Design a protein around this nucleic acid. Sequence first.
RNA 1: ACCCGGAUAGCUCAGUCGGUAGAGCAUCAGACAGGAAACUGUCUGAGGGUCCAGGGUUCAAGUCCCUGUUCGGGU
Lengths: 102, 101
Amino acid sequence: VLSGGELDKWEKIRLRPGGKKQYKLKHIVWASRELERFAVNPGLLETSEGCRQILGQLQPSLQTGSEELRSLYNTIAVLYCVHQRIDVKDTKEALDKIEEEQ
Amino acid sequence: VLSGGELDKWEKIRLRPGGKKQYKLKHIVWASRELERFAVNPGLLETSEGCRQILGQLQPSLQTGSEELRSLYNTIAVLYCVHQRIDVKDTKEALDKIEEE
RNA sequence: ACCCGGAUAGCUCAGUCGGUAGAGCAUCAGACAGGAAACUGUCUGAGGGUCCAGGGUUCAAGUCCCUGUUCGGGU
Ligand SMILES: [Mg+2]
């Protein structure tokens, strides 16, 4: 789902801006599982374009969505910046670079 | 109640194993205070034997004791390992080194 | 800008009188029933956290006080 060099990037990112907690492998695994429970092709995770399609498919449901959904949307955003080789240090930053594209 | 060199060790020990809080003087003071209310010589604190005597004297009362008592018993244990020059990094280790005997 | 409420296991959430934290799902391993078998079910165990960040009170803070960050809701 992620390359070798990308993992080392992934494992450097923090969940909260000032947090002392950062992403691990468990997040990717769990994300692919929850992707199927929502009737989505988990294969779309290993490409930057696949994530673009997923993120846009979930953008609307976010406003009315549950806390469990936003969490998923966030993890995919962070994972998108890694594929795009965009450098980010925490989830907030990832969401910002994704909104800058619009 | 404590020597100069022992203090430097005392104030390095952590209350909780991974805790970011460490022992200070207020703890030793507070322990001697609670000692007087129970009719015990606080002078027994500045000796390796004095703490050994207290710790064994309170072993029974522990099962039925208050939360504030456990606290006292622990603070005294740490104070014993410092007197004995036994190396400990937190209260937990002190309790372990006392049972290892 | 102001007021209110959240932040705790990979995720959603509980946590009582302050006294070092639990469940559900997820992940791993195992057991039992039916079945030659692939399999279809039922239960059990384990790992996994320092409780957003920084200070303060206290012998002792997830818990009480203040600040910052952040999310949602309201005016
Ligand atoms: Mg969470």
